[PDB]
């Protein structure tokens, strides 16, 4: 194996952390770096390729794309860090008012038996004229911090998951003075932010996730065989990975009702496969459609972040003309895009007569 992914250990956290935001300069406009989503599955497409110099130039190619359910995230806080001879130090964080039950579930571990008493005194700090103290915290961030991040959480109760506990993370704000970033976050308080607002189509991003576990597995599969340098038996899988350069092909709006329709296929259909995503369900929200395979199982929490470095390739400056998106069943050898197509192909049936 590679001595660069060792100490081959299970990921310390299920969420997966960014570990590096792109470097910040004040000249760029104010923007957010990262976002969150849940892996729904993957499907097949056909792209009219414009790669000047390729043998598939001006030809139709079949590609595999991963679909990420991305309900809008909610901003609930703002954290400010300072530079010290020992690194970055979180000087202070100021939250939003009216936190949601899902983020309070994130804070609690046994939510059902608990008195749900989190951040009540903080809301009283807003309401009872301790807004002087809160403004003092904002001004401390303005006048002492060098980098600002925003606290944001996902919407499980829109995601088709049995879970009810949300996911918090800090998304770094770049491109402006610290005062501009503080005002931006304070204005973003108690507001939903969308994936088409953070990213857009044609843009390569980086995906942070925890790759699927397989338990105690021997050297044959753990490293790929026929001291730390010697292949040993142990945990294989469930590993934190940051996979780079994945092209954002589409962002579907969820309420469009024609997410899977292209300018070539005039079929009013959505991204969800016929019968639903296997083991996941239906995508009823904003979704991100990106090229290739991506670390993580279905319904796993995923972090989507901007590229650290300005790109060096023509694959990152290309437009993606889509021809069609596969919506056949993933539960077996499916050959119909819609139930209407299946009915038109197979005619009417005995149960159709019995019901009608």
């Amino acid at each position: 194996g590679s001595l660069a992914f060792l100490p081959r250990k299970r990921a310390a956290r299920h969420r997966g952390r960014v570990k590096s935001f792109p470097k910040d300069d004040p000249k760029k406009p104010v923007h957010l770096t990262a976002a969150m989503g849940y892996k729904a599955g993957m499907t097949t497409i056909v792209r009219d390729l414009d790669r000047p110099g390729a043998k598939a130039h001006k030809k139709e190619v079949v590609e595999a794309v991963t679909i990420i359910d991305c309900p809008p995230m909610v901003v609930v806080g703002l954290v400010g860090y300072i530079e010290t001879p020992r690194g970055l130090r979180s000087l202070t964080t100021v939250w939003a008012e009216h936190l949601s039950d899902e983020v309070k579930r994130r804070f609690y571990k046994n939510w059902y038996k608990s008195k749900k008493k989190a951040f009540t005194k903080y809301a009283k700090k807003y309401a009872e004229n301790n807004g002087a103290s809160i403004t003092r915290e904002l001004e401390r961030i303005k006048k002492y911090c060098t980098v600002v991040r925003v606290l944001a959480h996902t919407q499980i109760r829109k995601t088709p998951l049995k879970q009810k506990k949300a996911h918090l993370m800090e998304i770094q704000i770049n491109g402006g003075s610290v005062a501009d970033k503080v005002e931006f976050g304070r204005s973003l308080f108690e507001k939903p932010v969308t994936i088409d607002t953070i990213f857009e189509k044609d843009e390569m991003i980086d995906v942070i996730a925890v790759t699927k576990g397989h338990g105690f597995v021997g050297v044959t599969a753990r490293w790929g065989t026929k001291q730390w340098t010697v292949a040993r038996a142990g945990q294989m899988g469930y590993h934190h990975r940051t996979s780079v350069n994945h092209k954002i092909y589409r962002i579907g709006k969820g309420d469009d009702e024609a997410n899977a329709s292209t300018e070539t296929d005039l079929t009013k259909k959505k991204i969800t496969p016929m019968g639903g995503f296997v083991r996941y369900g239906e995508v009823n929200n904003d979704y991100v459609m990106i090229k290739g395979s991506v670390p993580g199982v279905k319904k796993r929490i995923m972090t989507l972040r901007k590229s650290l470095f300005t790109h060096t390739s023509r694959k990152a400056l290309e437009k993606v003309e889509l021809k069609w998106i596969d919506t056949s069943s993933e539960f077996g050898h499916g050959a119909f895009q819609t139930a209407a197509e299946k009915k038109q192909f197979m005619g009417t049936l005995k149960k159709d007569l019995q019901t009608s």
Partner: protein, 62 residues
Amino acid sequence: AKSARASRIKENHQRFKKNIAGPVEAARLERLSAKLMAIAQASGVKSGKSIGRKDSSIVFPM
């Protein structure tokens, strides 16, 4: 074959970054930040203007 860390390769990458990806990503960021702004704008001691004190060690205790 030139290594991925070759100086000439790095210089070519720098030129490509500065002359194509620069402008493309600048326009992309302008549009995205416009959308972000759309969604966003959709006594000192007793007021908080004067940043006062809230509420191991580095020095030896005397």
